[PDB]
Amino acid sequence: SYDIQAWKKQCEELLNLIFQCEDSEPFRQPVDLLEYPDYRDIIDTPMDFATVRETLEAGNYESPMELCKDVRLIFSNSKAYTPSKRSRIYSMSLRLSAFFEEHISSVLSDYKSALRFHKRN
């Protein structure tokens, strides 16, 4: 299964699944500083799933590893901003992270395999 390009549509489909998850609700658009006035005191690099989807559709990711780094940033930002490990939005982030990691592991594997096949000679 050595298609170097196949990761892109696989990531589009996984983002569609994440947008259907009720657990993505807090993470679907950049945080609003009116409601969370100190957010940018704590978080140096905001990230959200609409930004990830737009970057993918612009042709601004070279690899699924770069997409994976931005999606992991969504979850690290929620862990850094939460006042409690028992918070509602942090708890949603942990379930969504588990779902994402379960689905991205074949996308990464297949891509890295396809690039090794391309370099085989």
Q: Taking the complex as a whole, how short is the minimal distance between the CB of residue 48 and ligand ZJE, in angstroms?
A: 7
Q: Which two tokens stand for residue 79?
A: 């862990």
User: Closest CB to ligand ZJE among 22 and 62?
Assistant: 22
Q: Is the dihedral of CA 15, 24, 32, 76 positive or negative?
A: negative
Q: How many CA atoms lie within 13 A of 8 on its CB side?
A: 12
Q: Taking the complex as a whole, how short is the minimal distance between the CB of residue 7 and ligand ZJE, in angstroms?
A: 27
Q: At what angle do helices 64-81 and 49-57 cross, to 10 degrees?
A: 160
Measure Cα distances from 87 to 1, 45, 55, 59 in Å. 42, 21, 29, 35
Q: Which residue is nearest to ligand ZJE (CB)?
A: 78
Q: Taking the complex as a whole, how short is the minimal distance between the CB of residue 40 and ligand ZJE, in angstroms?
A: 11
- What does the per-residue mask of binding to ligand ZJE show for 16-45, with x meaning CB under 6 A? ---------xx--x-xx--xx---------
Q: Taking the complex as a whole, how short is the minimal distance between the CB of residue 78 and ligand ZJE, in angstroms?
A: 3
Q: Which of 55, 76, 82, 91 binds ligand ZJE (CB under 6 A)?
A: 82
Say if CB 51 and CB 70 are below 8 A apart: yes
User: Which residues contact ligand ZJE (rule: CB under 6 A)?
Assistant: 25-26, 29, 31-32, 35-36, 78, 81-82, 87, 89-90
